[PDB]
Design a protein around this motif. Sequence first.
Motif, PDB file in Angstrom:
ATOM      1  N   UNK A  77       0.863  -1.212   0.000  1.00 11.80           N
ATOM      2  CA  UNK A  77       0.000   0.000   0.000  1.00 11.80           C
ATOM      3  C   UNK A  77       0.890   1.250   0.000  1.00 11.80           C
ATOM      4  N   UNK A  78       1.989   1.272   0.754  1.00 14.03           N
ATOM      5  CA  UNK A  78       2.876   2.468   0.834  1.00 14.03           C
ATOM      6  C   UNK A  78       3.563   2.701  -0.517  1.00 14.03           C
ATOM      7  N   UNK A  81       0.888   3.966  -2.968  1.00 13.11           N
ATOM      8  CA  UNK A  81       0.467   5.354  -2.647  1.00 13.11           C
ATOM      9  C   UNK A  81       1.512   6.293  -3.258  1.00 13.11           C
ATOM     10  N   UNK A  85       0.871   9.084  -6.537  1.00 12.38           N
ATOM     11  CA  UNK A  85       1.368  10.487  -6.490  1.00 12.38           C
ATOM     12  C   UNK A  85       2.150  10.821  -7.768  1.00 12.38           C
ATOM     13  N   UNK A 102      -7.466   5.168  -3.959  1.00  8.27           N
ATOM     14  CA  UNK A 102      -6.504   4.256  -3.287  1.00  8.27           C
ATOM     15  C   UNK A 102      -7.281   3.200  -2.496  1.00  8.27           C
ATOM     16  N   UNK A 103      -8.295   3.622  -1.746  1.00  2.00           N
ATOM     17  CA  UNK A 103      -9.066   2.739  -0.839  1.00  2.00           C
ATOM     18  C   UNK A 103      -9.559   1.515  -1.629  1.00  2.00           C
ATOM     19  N   UNK A 252      -3.841   0.483   9.156  1.00  2.00           N
ATOM     20  CA  UNK A 252      -3.892   0.932   7.736  1.00  2.00           C
ATOM     21  C   UNK A 252      -4.841   0.035   6.938  1.00  2.00           C
TER      22      UNK A 252
END
Lengths: 261, 10
Positions: A77-78, A81, A85, A102-103, A252
């Motif tokens: 996920x990081x 993300x 961007x 993202x969700x 998270x």
Amino acid sequence: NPESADLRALAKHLYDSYIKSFPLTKAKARAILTGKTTDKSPFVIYDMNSLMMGEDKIKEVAIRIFQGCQFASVEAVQEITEYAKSIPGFVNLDLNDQVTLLKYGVHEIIYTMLASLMNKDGVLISEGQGFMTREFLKSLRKPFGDFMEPKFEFAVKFNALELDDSDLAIFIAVIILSGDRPGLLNVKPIEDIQDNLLQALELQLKLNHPESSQLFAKLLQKMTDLRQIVTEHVQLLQVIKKTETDMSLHPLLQEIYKDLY
Amino acid sequence: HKILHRLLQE
């Protein structure tokens, strides 16, 4: 031509940001999986005993393996993300829409990218340092036994399309910019970006696989397949949360899973 | 979504 040029630039820019964002690419994972590399082969985990010896190089055992996947997902996920961007115009969107995209996106992209790490026999773990056999994962006590089999089933079909990193960079960008995610406030700008990405993906698939016949169309069919897999996965997580009280869900993950399908 | 907000803002 000049419209083509802009789409080629976007494909190049996404590919770059994909390489920066993701530690283990499909290229390295293939190289490791074939064995056709100079690097040390991965520690194979096929059973409880092999798992224990494995801990060094990389609570009930099933629960231990589930927490493992949990830590790995959070890292994914990081990475995803940071990658969103990079997608031109993504940061310019409404922050609540950025969150919504993202969700609903991350699990679809995790399963897309898991396939790069997978073959029919098993899945590379801990950045290709480990290789956990599919049979071993299947063998886990219910419900943990049927947790990864759907991801293996999808990965063998998706792996047939023989996409490369440059194709995948655009494909994951197209998944992220989905206009039909529930609860979006401003769909039009999201759709505008997805239209640019979809054209970029179409060009890339014609150029990178000129022999391939309607790869782009088959790839768009797989996006609908991915949504179904993400729903089933949330169902098992819904189940596992209630049935096991020894399981702590990462915050998270809780944000994402909260009010999802 | 404070963690997600945080990651997006970072």
